[PDB]
Amino acid sequence: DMILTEEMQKIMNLIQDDENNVFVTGKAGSGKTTFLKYLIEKSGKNCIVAAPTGIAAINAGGVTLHSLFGIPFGPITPYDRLENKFSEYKVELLLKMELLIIDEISMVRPDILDTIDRKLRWVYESDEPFGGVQVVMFGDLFQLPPVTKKQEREILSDFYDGFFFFNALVFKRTGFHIVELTKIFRQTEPEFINVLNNIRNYQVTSDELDLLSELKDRKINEYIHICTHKADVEKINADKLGEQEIRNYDIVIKDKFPESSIPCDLHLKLRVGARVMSLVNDSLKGYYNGMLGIVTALEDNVITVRMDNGRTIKFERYTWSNTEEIGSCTQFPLTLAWAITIHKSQGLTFDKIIIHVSHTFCPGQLYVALSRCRTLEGIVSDAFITKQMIIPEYALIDFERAYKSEGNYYGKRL
DNA sequence: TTTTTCCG
Ligand SMILES: Nc1ncnc2c1ncn2[C@@H]1O[C@H](COP(=O)(O)OP(=O)(O)O)[C@@H](O)[C@H]1O
Ligand code: ALF
Ligand SMILES: [Mg+2]
DSSP states (O other): OOOOOHHHHHHHHHHHHOOSEEEEEOSTTSSHHHHHHHHHHHOSSOEEEEESSHHHHHHHTSEEHHHHHTOOSSOOOTTSOOOOOOOHHHHHHHHHOOEEEESSGGGOOHHHHHHHHHHHHHHHTOOSGGGGOEEEEEEOTTSOOOOOOHHHHHHHTTTOSSSSGGGOGGGGTOEEEEEEOOOOOSOOOHHHHHHHHHHHTTOOOHHHHGGGGGGBTOOOOOSEEEESOHHHHHHHHHHHHOSTTOEEEEOEEESSOOGGGOOSOSEEEEOTTOEEEEOSOBGGGTBOTTOEEEEEEEOSSOEEEEETTSOEEEEOOEEEEEOOOOEEEEEOSEEEOSSEEHHHHTTOOBSSEEEEOSSOOSTTHHHHHHHTBSSSTTEEESSOOOGGGOOOOHHHHHHHHHHHHTTSEEEOOO
16 A cells, blocks of 8 residues: 655665665655665665664664664764774674665764764775765654754864754765655645645744644543653653552662763653553664563563564663763663653654644754644644744755755765 | 664
């Protein structure tokens, strides 16, 4: 029931005939990730798939960029020395790879792409960008941008003219075609589609937004909550958890580990039937950051979860390090997940959603929230949708103007 | 504000 469009066929043929890098873009729900999976299945190339968030990576069938390439947290400058500590298994996988596929490219920082370039040139012992691997990037720059803190932007501004993937320094040595998928599949209502598109490109009017008046406090566990803020996610999850038959698991912290740096729950509260997400990758055991499941049993030292993909996993406690090394913390690598942030929702489709957007603070955040849903009637909102929720990023206007006027190509022409 | 590592 997947439709192969002529645009998709042309892009397939482009990637097979032309070794250039490619950005496949298009609006929310235009079939980008669906086509990604088609491209790989049909290409004869060895492909590896990655994405910046764990949820998006799982949705595309791959792994996070940070896991695949062993990337540390925090900004990486071109002068920082990288630990090249790949196992032989990982080196071999990266050497066999012919095509690197990255989904949700909009959330990829430019220093992440440059780190990937540097690590691949080290693995391949080559001066070719990305070690000579062909890179195909999928996404929508008008959805969420990469997560950066103010201090990180300050550090990065010495080397980067902006904070989107196309600002990476590697694009002074290589470049990419931009191709687009222009048919929307996720939604089917033309007026809903028109308002989504005009929110996306900042052109929406007051009159167009009137279509969304029925969202706020709409009268109706089928509705999925997606929120701008983690504090809201935590409240909704605690509500849905309840107080019946709860088990609590306390973190053990050992020495230095600021509380604002702890990656896990301080007091993990669970029950049988609880919707949860894995926080860590363990490919040997078949689980990965962002994988979703349902708790089926709780014990002293083991939490049993039936994953959405049908696997039952027995989670034991995991130990994080804060480094060199000074302190550590130990806790089950699980967190409740009925509710999720909008950043985590990017890439997913839902029939029924409740969005908490009374405070938006990222370009593309409102657009991602609304565009998750297949129909207008399936959205409930905590707030009236207004133009103040839209935050323009004019560097994206400049970028599209540049490539559209220069032959749908960006970066160094080869 | 929001996110993210290293196959035993
Ligand atoms: N080629 C296609 N034919 C039919 N339906 C599609 C196609 N591509 C996507 N869809 C529908 O749209 C939904 C979202 O598509 P997806 O690939 O996730 O969009 P994108 O990654 O562009 O946001 C899918 O769940 C499916 O219902
Ligand atoms: F562009 Al998408 F889900 F990947 F809307
Ligand atoms: Mg997608």
